[PDB]
Scaffold this active site. Structure first.
Site, mmCIF file in Angstrom:
data_model
loop_
_atom_site.group_PDB
_atom_site.id
_atom_site.type_symbol
_atom_site.label_atom_id
_atom_site.label_comp_id
_atom_site.label_asym_id
_atom_site.label_seq_id
_atom_site.Cartn_x
_atom_site.Cartn_y
_atom_site.Cartn_z
ATOM 1 N N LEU A 28 0.849 -1.219 0.000
ATOM 2 C CA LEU A 28 0.000 0.000 0.000
ATOM 3 C C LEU A 28 0.876 1.257 0.000
ATOM 4 C CD1 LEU A 28 -2.929 -0.807 2.455
ATOM 5 C CD2 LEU A 28 -2.956 -0.506 -0.057
ATOM 6 N N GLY A 29 2.194 1.087 -0.074
ATOM 7 C CA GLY A 29 3.149 2.192 -0.260
ATOM 8 C C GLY A 29 4.128 2.284 0.897
ATOM 9 N N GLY A 31 7.370 5.106 2.767
ATOM 10 C CA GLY A 31 7.664 6.516 3.061
ATOM 11 C C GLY A 31 8.897 6.583 3.908
ATOM 12 N N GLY A 34 8.414 4.308 7.082
ATOM 13 C CA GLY A 34 8.307 2.834 7.019
ATOM 14 C C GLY A 34 7.402 2.430 5.879
ATOM 15 N N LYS A 35 6.646 1.361 6.081
ATOM 16 C CA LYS A 35 5.882 0.657 5.020
ATOM 17 C C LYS A 35 4.419 0.615 5.441
ATOM 18 C CE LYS A 35 9.362 -2.810 3.707
ATOM 19 N NZ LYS A 35 9.822 -4.217 3.726
ATOM 20 N N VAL A 36 3.517 0.607 4.479
ATOM 21 C CA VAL A 36 2.105 0.244 4.753
ATOM 22 C C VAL A 36 1.796 -0.990 3.903
ATOM 23 C CG1 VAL A 36 -0.237 1.054 5.055
ATOM 24 C CG2 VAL A 36 1.621 2.720 5.073
ATOM 25 N N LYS A 52 0.537 -0.182 9.166
ATOM 26 C CA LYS A 52 1.702 0.703 9.027
ATOM 27 C C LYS A 52 2.844 0.076 9.836
ATOM 28 C CE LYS A 52 2.423 5.707 9.150
ATOM 29 N NZ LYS A 52 2.169 6.982 9.877
ATOM 30 N N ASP A 149 -3.445 19.092 9.741
ATOM 31 C CA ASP A 149 -2.976 18.695 8.378
ATOM 32 C C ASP A 149 -4.099 18.101 7.522
ATOM 33 O OD1 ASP A 149 -1.183 18.689 6.315
ATOM 34 O OD2 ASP A 149 -0.135 16.960 7.071
HETATM 35 C C1 KHC Z 1 -6.089 3.163 5.896
HETATM 36 N N1 KHC Z 1 -5.312 3.451 4.689
HETATM 37 C C2 KHC Z 1 -5.773 3.405 3.390
HETATM 38 C C3 KHC Z 1 -4.783 3.816 2.526
HETATM 39 C C4 KHC Z 1 -3.607 4.098 3.316
HETATM 40 C C5 KHC Z 1 -2.312 4.543 3.028
HETATM 41 C C6 KHC Z 1 -1.413 4.786 4.054
HETATM 42 C C7 KHC Z 1 -1.792 4.584 5.375
HETATM 43 CL CL1 KHC Z 1 -0.667 4.943 6.645
HETATM 44 C C8 KHC Z 1 -3.066 4.125 5.681
HETATM 45 CL CL2 KHC Z 1 -3.533 3.897 7.319
HETATM 46 C C9 KHC Z 1 -3.976 3.876 4.658
HETATM 47 C C10 KHC Z 1 -5.026 4.067 1.045
HETATM 48 C C11 KHC Z 1 -5.268 5.512 0.874
HETATM 49 N N2 KHC Z 1 -5.352 6.652 0.816
HETATM 50 C C12 KHC Z 1 -6.191 3.143 0.591
HETATM 51 C C13 KHC Z 1 -5.627 1.727 0.397
HETATM 52 C C14 KHC Z 1 -6.658 0.755 -0.138
HETATM 53 N N3 KHC Z 1 -7.173 1.190 -1.440
HETATM 54 C C15 KHC Z 1 -7.745 2.546 -1.362
HETATM 55 C C16 KHC Z 1 -6.791 3.560 -0.760
HETATM 56 N N4 KHC Z 1 -7.235 2.996 1.619
HETATM 57 C C17 KHC Z 1 -7.067 3.040 2.951
HETATM 58 O O1 KHC Z 1 -7.960 2.711 3.731
#
Ligand code: KHC
Length: 340
Positions: A28-29, A31, A34-36, A52, A149
């Site tokens: 999920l990316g 930074g 760290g990592k998600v 996270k 923010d």
């Molecule tokens: C809860 N959440 C979610 C994302 C995160 C990206 C980074 C982080 Cl730290 C969190 Cl907690 C995220 C993404 C965004 N913006 C997505 C990841 C899943 N696909 C849609 C966007 N949805 C989240 O609930």
């Protein structure tokens, strides 16, 4: 059975576990922090979480601990989960990696706008998103908390499944407020620079002290962006940003000019600004009075613009509060479904 790379990230990939409970199914990316990763939580219904995973680095570990402490206080004040903040489901220290689990939600309001080619949200969607944003932050503001923010990237759709019409239209405008990493209680140290540039209010730029009204300014900026699809203040410099505010909203209050250490922006109480320069001509041609950005002249649009102008009041002590914003005539347009 566990290791770190040279940057102190947790070495992991799809198929790994944590806590004999999280099964990593997606990325999920990343930074500086760290990592998600997207995980199944096998202690819930194999339900999807964003986890996270903070680097094994002192300054990130401590920033994550302070965020957890904020999320714990929000949770204690909202047990029932009525005020639309992203749900923290769990947190743990995994070999020095702070780990925070959240409910997995849909796209952020920015990603959705980008993916529709920056074609703006329909007014009824702007109104429903505005109402939820006001409701969520009013609750935090009444519990002595400022987010600091707010931006479209920090506002998530619960489900971002869209219909295509002869434009993408999100089926359900239910949103949640994310990213409490900078949230500050009234009694805590207020750092000088808060908010992302585009969403930053004049009292922060002039360093005159900030509190809950900071978040109201940010929301006014966000509503403009939902409504037009482009940012209200497209600048990366304080002196230009204050000039843009004056061209769009009217004169800066003289007491805010008198009180700022940043006297260098001013000459005989006026912003220093060369109308005849390249930058002068650009701002002249692109930054018009706020009312000139309305797309339609019917009541619903007039009501949005009246609320938005009160959210973008220069003086933070005169700026509308979210408790007041929730009573604005704009919200009479909500369906009985949306209004609860
Ligand atoms: C809860 N959440 C979610 C994302 C995160 C990206 C980074 C982080 Cl730290 C969190 Cl907690 C995220 C993404 C965004 N913006 C997505 C990841 C899943 N696909 C849609 C966007 N949805 C989240 O609930």
């Amino acid at each position: 059975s566990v290791e770190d790379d040279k940057e102190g990230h947790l070495v992991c990939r799809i198929g790994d576990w944590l806590q004999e409970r999280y099964e990593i199914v997606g990325n999920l990316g990343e930074g500086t922090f760290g990592k998600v990763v997207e995980c199944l939580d096998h202690a819930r219904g194999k339900s999807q979480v964003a986890l996270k995973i903070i680097r094994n680095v002192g300054k990130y570990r401590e920033a994550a601990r302070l965020e957890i402490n904020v999320l714990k206080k929000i949770k204690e004040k909202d047990k029932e989960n009525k005020f639309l903040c992203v749900l923290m489901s769990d947190w743990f220290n995994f070999h020095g990696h702070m780990c925070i689990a959240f409910e997995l939600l849909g796209k952020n309001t920015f990603e959705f706008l980008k993916e529709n080619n920056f074609q703006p949200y329909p007014l009824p969607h702007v109104r429903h998103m505005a109402y939820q944003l006001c409701h969520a932050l009013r609750f935090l503001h009444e519990n002595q908390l400022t987010h600091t923010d707010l931006k479209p990237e920090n506002i998530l759709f619960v489900n971002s499944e869209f219909e295509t019409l002869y434009e993408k239209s999100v089926k359900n405008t239910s949103i949640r407020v994310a990213d409490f990493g900078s949230a500050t209680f009234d009694h805590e140290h207020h750092t000088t620079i808060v908010a992302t540039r585009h969403y930053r209010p004049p009292e922060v730029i002039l360093e005159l002290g900030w509190a809950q009204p900071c978040d109201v300014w940010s929301i006014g900026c966000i509503l403009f962006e939902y409504y037009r699809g482009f940012t209200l203040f497209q600048t990366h410099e304080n002196r230009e940003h204050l000039v843009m505010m004056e061209k769009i909203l009217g004169p800066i209050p003289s007491h805010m000019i008198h009180r700022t250490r940043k006297q260098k922006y001013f000459y005989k109480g006026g912003l220093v600004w060369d109308e005849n320069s390249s930058d002068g001509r650009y701002v002249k041609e692109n930054c018009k009075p706020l009312k000139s950005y309305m797309l339609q002249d019917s009541l619903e649009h007039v009501q949005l613009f009246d609320l938005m102008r009160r959210m973008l009041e220069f003086d933070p002590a005169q700026r509308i509060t979210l408790a007041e914003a929730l009573l604005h005539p704009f919200f009479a347009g909500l369906t009985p479904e949306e209004r609860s």
